Symmetry: D2
Subunit: 726 residues, 4 copies
């Protein structure tokens, strides 16, 4: 027996905070978190304890340490079928990654509506607040490979598979409400432009290179999503703290056959929150798995990601009532014009067991709809419909990918399709065609209807000639970027300028930089001038005189487009670094830890080595990590309690921890003699908003720190960070 | 409602003779025939009746007759996801066929040993007469594609998957006891030479072409199995009436560690029986599915194929006691020297439900052995071990082919292998490596032992240099061909000479024919001269003086090598054509049909059209097929009852039916005025052996006919057939 | 282990009647028959005479008769990379056959129009009577596997790839001028019904079984092509003696933008001829490669298949 | 075989030998080389046995393994010398 006598190898099967226990497969960590999908997977879950090691054919292995050879120093023999099977399986473990969104992190959960939506859709999953639908959700980046980093600047994917009683519905969305391009014909062009350039396959996980900016400068339709990517939307704090959007206008269809246009929204119940660029980039180096880890540990802790599903609903007779086209996926529907109706809530409460089997092999596709939903003629949506089943033929090895356990519907499925690579279902129907008499025509078609009916398309009128032509109504590129720009706070605007300025500096051909600045001058002069100044470019006379684009249906801003304009902060699940010394003031720790626990905020206790230190009353304090081992990048705030500060006051690493947190606009709290650190961050004797300081860590000091945490970052500090060398 | 009101679309779920009811999936035909493997397949069996038609995602389909278009005469729209899935799945139905043995027919059954073989092998499936092991057996030809014909001249595969409690064991054998070549390195050469020629891909299912006989003429090691293929062994009547062999010497290992050499046999309990060449060739035309059909219908009828497993056992100390090398797969072990010891019985008693899922995807591999068995250094076996896992990576799409339902062990299997295309099992083990502490090292290795122990190779001594060299003990090529020849009856020898003569006549380059004739003269002068005469080739004086190879350990024949020298006739499961007329003598038909039934011999009532005819007494007789529709090739014997013979006496099809059955040596019985057909086949007034005739079908008429059927064919008729124009 | 002294192993590279010489690869049988497509394949043609036997990595092999083993009666060794490559390539030879038309026989050739068709089409390959377009044509059955028989009763495919100066044009037609069904959505239903039945995978190359006639009886739109299949059109004497048709109405578009509806036809210049059933069925047994062989030998003899 | 899609991965241009390569292997997914040899097996007479084996020698010879002496039992065992 190799496990330690004390059983400390096995994590407790109960919710525990980040870092308290080793992480574990979801059915071991939380064996009684159940939903119909998780239960239906039981037939393929495989255990291990108390079983003999075997070949895949069931043969018990005696010696899993050696190949069969002629003599113990002799050649390996072809007859070693045990070594061959083991090496053969290893040799074939990898499958192609997804063409886009290869990097992603996934969890199981459930959805339930707040009320029956039968007046607007006959979709069974929306019919009853007591109808619970299992989901599997995968979040992702777009450009980088499956082994690239999480906290890159990128769009994020947000894909939900709903296992409904009437079919799988996949809502395959992103974290911004529009896309870069209008027509699916251009997708391979845009994707090839953003992906690593073809000669040398650089750069990974970055749009900051010549080909992406060349395409953008030549295709002004991209500029709206480009604005979102360059804003702090492009660098979320966590998958829990971003929005989700279906992007396209779809249709809901009710039992009477009425169509209503809908765009889908996911609202994060933990609020909106993003990193800042220097912090995100440094975090791709210190923890390229930061978002995947955060999601997994949030669920292991009981800080379940929750989202509210929202619909923007537009009556059919209102199709042409806006000054943009509802079918144009480079256009958003401002919430000031069409409010989001809150429709239900989705909770992600269990991690997978096996990343490969359940996350890597999951296949989502927006064409997977159910009765009660329908498409529109959005030309980006239309072409997506051809891509997501075809790509699964090579990625997942053939046309039976719906039989891979995670992809299986939980509802019945029966039809006349047969064979294909790795066919699992063994059909007993005498007939494989219809119409048939020899099985009395079963399985049989079902007419459409109010519930449990077959799928019928909404009978939309189509009138026009067969043309490859962009609708003239899509030919406006600057008004939504401007609406987004004017809706941002001044610090959000500064971060945009800085995103453009940083990316364009990495474009080697200067004419591309100049062409992009020309585009910006069609959006907003202030934006254009600020980026130009950072690039050593001077706007022309003509550029200074470009008329700004019109408002959007009378709107000159919409605060719902900002991450931060309207407070919606939530501290539950956030994390505080606590910087220890070798004789900590135990009374500070008690107060700190108590106040954090009350608000569900986690802590990590840091020092200059591993093991433990002992507090002034002899309390033994275990150390989670070192100052260098768990950088401030990985926490939301830093608290330094009182004690023997000289242990740490000349630790370069301790001082750095505080300078980095300060630069990144994180709340800092300093108690008693911890205020000696005020000198390393140049804080005035009388204080500075965003630095909490007191004689000791009482409940007033903690309430103040916790109020800074609710506001996420200390934006007022921005003009001050310029001076600190960090 | 398309089924007929009378429920006649659906076959009775009870055993019924061939042609009585439509054939059906085995679990519908025989729902009460069970074994552990068939029961373990229940998790993936899918029914159909009373279910709605859906996509693979579970969405009900309303109109499965039409694509979605703009206008009922307009263009098909990209948004038709239901059409798109259905056509995508069809588009990818096919998988590569097996490189060899692509044509094959399979069934489920079970095996049980007669007594415990613990004294000689610790194999669990052979430890207890009350231990039943489910099996799946596939029979096959070798050369032709999956769409080629059954009754070709070729070797046949006989592969048995034993689902044991200690792992899958696959006994992957053929219907002759030797192979064509000695070393696996030559397998691609040999197979390329027999398969269709690469410029034009001709001929299918035939060795009768230049490249095959060019290779044979240049590689005399092939001559032994070529003798078997040219004999009637190459054209079996049925997979139920051929022998099976593992060919290689393997080892049995008992609990005390003692190794015994073993060769595996299957004995057909239905006896040995083959077609004749003209009949087999013509049958590839009239019913290319004849063996597949015959196997399925025997099982539906309850004529379960039964086989007795037998072992030839040779003590380790007798390795070098024969004139041939036990490890040379081109040499048989004559049963006069080493008898087959009866070991147990295999019964095949249920058809699959879906041929593709269970037959086409089954994967057998002779490296799949279990503790108690082991390999030897046979250099053909040694190379097979590298082929059968490797080929399944492309054929079955990856390394998880053991998760395809038919291939799954019924015993436990657990290990540290992960991922690969189409991964079904969701592993929960915290560890994917060993040694590990985090899962207390589970699943764990198991030491070898007398039962339930881990696999350990027998510690055979290896001594020699690394060489690419054929053992000098393998360099003898003609004695085993000659033993086989001398062991055949005179009519079997004629059929051998005619096989060689027909095949070499299709060899376009005459020097190759000559070279083959020269090899035959090294085997037996009579055989060589008789083939030469048929080819218009004259042996040289040198050829006439080649001295014959020596006897094999003193044997100048071994009757167990003949199909027919020792009667083993079994009529149960055979079929008789009955040629009706429009006023049959009902008393003849009563006597004929009941006598056949009592011996389990089936009948097919034939006429010049379908429907019914009415007997003399008003009995309504349903017609199974027309004379052209179910030719004499498909039956074992022909009976013509008395009645209005003038009805059919001038029917060329009726007369030809008898001439064909006569030429192919089948018993023929003629009652009453049916004896008017005697002149068609030129029978003397006083009669001839092999023709049953009387005033009525009563008295001894059916017994005499059944006696002829027990003897299979009327070999004494061979001289009389040369003349007949049929 | 060599050639006969008399050179009789090797077919003459001149046209010869069927049976007169062993058949051979086209480039060795008729080296001076060329066209732009045949020439362009020269980069991948590989010869063999006078060259040493190698691995795929170019290593010369000394003994292609034996595996490497520890002693001449001993076990095969894992380090035999030459055995391993050879057996690996063998083990992966097969690719999936076509879902339909898996059985088929093909040849190279060339097309030219009799006059310019520029008044009704701007297609370049029909623009000039003296501009020749190479073609590759595959003729096929429908139902059976790639190892099924030629002279079955079935529809025949007749697919022509035209390598034009403005792109590949494939005219993918059959030997009757209609199909069995109206809407592509039913194709898997129809094909499943005519193909071997799914429990036992019988019958090969035959529509003569319950499922096909079930579908037909329930889908009267099939009756027209069924009449054709049941006539002697179902059993052609040769691919040289059947008609071809594109079946669908397509359009021709000329330089002025004018659309003309068109249906395509191939006329066999050797005339129309079919077997009779008893002969066709028996020939599936005596020579299941009859049409493949007949096509190949007609081309070797100079009886080139011609179609208008 | 799975990474590069089949057994003809040596015909992918970067992997191709620059020296000659000729043998009797055929087919496989994505087969580029179009073999004209009448024979796809050896020994053959119909192409005078080409391409032909080549004895080992000082230069341009066929591969023969060094005839290392092998002596021991068939074991799954680590050599004590490695411990
Ligand atoms: C509004 C625009 C789009 C959105 C919101 C979107 C969203 C996504 C998301 C979230 C994923 C990852 C799903 C997963 O986690 O496995 C994904 C994958 C994919 N998308 Fe899109 N996408 C868009 C546009 C397009 C277009 C226009 C195409 C092609 C025409 C395309 C083709 C694909 C393909 C090939 C994948 C890999 C799918 C797979 O392997 O399963 N996408 N998309
Ligand atoms: C004693 C000599 C041999 C016998 C009795 C034998 C028997 C068989 C049989 C019965 C099958 C068909 C199994 C099925 O029904 O799926 C088969 C398949 C096969 N054999 Fe052998 N075989 C022999 C020699 C070899 C050799 C030397 C090799 C190559 C080194 C080889 C490679 C293959 C391969 C590639 C398959 C296809 C296996 C698959 O796709 O699953 N065989 N053999
Ligand atoms: C007018 C009716 C049709 C005709 C004349 C036709 C003709 C043909 C021909 C001649 C081939 C063989 C090409 C070759 O030699 O490789 C073929 C292959 C094929 N056809 Fe059709 N066909 C028809 C309808 C359909 C339909 C409705 C579908 C599916 C929607 C279909 C799907 C296929 C597929 C999957 C192949 C295999 C193609 C390949 O593997 O390369 N066909 N067809």
């Amino acid at each position: 027996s190799l496990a330690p006598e004390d059983g400390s190898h096995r994590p407790a099967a109960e919710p525990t905070p980040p870092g308290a226990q080793p992480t574990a497969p979801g059915s071991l960590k939380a064996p009684d978190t159940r939903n119909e999908k998780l239960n239906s997977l039981e037939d393929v879950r495989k255990g291990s304890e108390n079983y003999a090691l075997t070949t895949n054919q069931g043969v018990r292995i005696a010696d899993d340490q050696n190949s069969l050879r002629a003599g113990s120093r002799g050649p390996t023999l072809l007859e070693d079928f045990i070594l061959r099977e083991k090496i053969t399986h290893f040799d074939h473990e990898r499958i192609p990654e997804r063409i886009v969104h290869a990097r992603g992190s996934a969890a199981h959960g459930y959805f339930q509506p707040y009320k029956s939506l039968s007046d607007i859709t006959k979709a069974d999953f929306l019919s009853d607040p007591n109808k619970i639908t299992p989901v599997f959700v995968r979040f992702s980046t777009v450009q980088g490979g499956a082994g690239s980093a999480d906290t890159v600047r990128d769009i994020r994917g947000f894909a939900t598979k709903f296992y409904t009683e009437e079919g799988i519905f996949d809502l395959v969305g992103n974290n911004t409400p529009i896309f870069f391009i209008q027509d699916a014909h251009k997708f391979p062009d845009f994707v090839h432009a953003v992906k690593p350039e073809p000669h040398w396959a650089i750069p990974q996980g970055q749009s900051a290179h010549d080909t992406f900016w060349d395409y953008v400068s030549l295709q002004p339709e991209t500029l709206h999503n480009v604005m979102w990517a360059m804003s702090d939307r492009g660098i979320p704090r966590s998958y829990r703290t971003m929005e989700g959007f279906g992007i396209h206008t779809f249709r809901l269809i009710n039992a009477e056959g009425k169509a209503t246009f809908v765009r889908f929204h996911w609202k994060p119940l933990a609020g909106k929150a993003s990193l800042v660029w220097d912090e995100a980039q440094k975090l791709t180096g210190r923890d390229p798995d930061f978002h995947r880890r955060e999601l997994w540990e949030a669920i292991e802790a009981g800080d379940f990601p929750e989202y509210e599903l929202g619909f923007q609903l537009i009556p059919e007779e209102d199709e042409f009532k806006f000054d943009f086209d509802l079918l144009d996926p480079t256009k958003l529907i401002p919430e000031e014009l069409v409010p989001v109706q809150r429709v239900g809530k989705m909770v992600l409460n269990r991690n997978p067991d096996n990343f490969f089997a359940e996350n890597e092999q999951a296949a989502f596709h927006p064409g997977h709809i159910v009765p009660g939903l329908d498409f529109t003629n959005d030309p980006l949506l239309q072409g997506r419909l051809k891509s997501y089943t075809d790509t699964q033929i090579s990625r997942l090895g053939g046309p039976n990918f719906h039989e891979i356990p995670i992809n299986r519907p939980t509802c019945p499925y029966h039809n006349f399709q047969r064979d294909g690579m790795h066919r699992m279902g063994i059909d007993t129907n005498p007939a494989n065609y219809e119409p048939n008499s020899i099985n009395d025509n079963w399985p049989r078609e079902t007419p459409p209807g109010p519930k449990r009916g077959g799928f019928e398309s909404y009978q939309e009128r189509v009138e026009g000639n067969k043309v490859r032509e962009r609708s003239p109504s899509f030919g406006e590129y600057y008004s939504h970027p401007r609406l987004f720009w004017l809706s941002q706070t001044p610090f959000e605007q500064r971060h945009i300028v800085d995103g453009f300025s940083f990316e364009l500096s990495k474009v080697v051909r200067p004419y591309i930089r100049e062409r992009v600045v020309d585009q910006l001058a069609h959006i907003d002069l202030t934006l254009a001038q600020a980026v130009a100044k950072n690039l050593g470019i001077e706007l022309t006379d003509d550029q200074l005189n470009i008329t700004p684009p019109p408002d959007v249906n009378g709107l000159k801003k919409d605060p719902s487009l900002s991450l931060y304009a309207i407070p919606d902060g939530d501290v539950k699940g956030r994390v505080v670094a606590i910087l220890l010394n070798d004789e900590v003031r135990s009374a500070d720790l008690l107060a700190i830890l108590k106040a954090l626990k009350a608000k569900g905020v986690h802590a990590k206790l840091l020092y200059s080595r591993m093991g433990e230190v002992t507090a002034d009353d002899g309390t033994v304090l275990p150390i989670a990590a070192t100052f260098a081992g768990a950088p401030s990048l990985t926490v939301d705030a830093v608290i330094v309690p009182c004690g023997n500060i000289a242990d740490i006051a000349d630790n370069g690493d301790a001082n750095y921890y505080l300078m980095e947190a300060y630069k990144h606009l994180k709340p800092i709290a300093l108690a008693g003699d911890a205020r000696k650190f005020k000198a390393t961050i140049k804080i005035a004797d009388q204080g500075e908003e965003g630095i909490v300081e007191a004689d000791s860590a009482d409940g007033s000091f903690m309430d103040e720190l916790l109020t800074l945490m609710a506001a996420h970052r200390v934006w007022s500090r921005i003009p001050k960070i310029d001076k600190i060398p960090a």
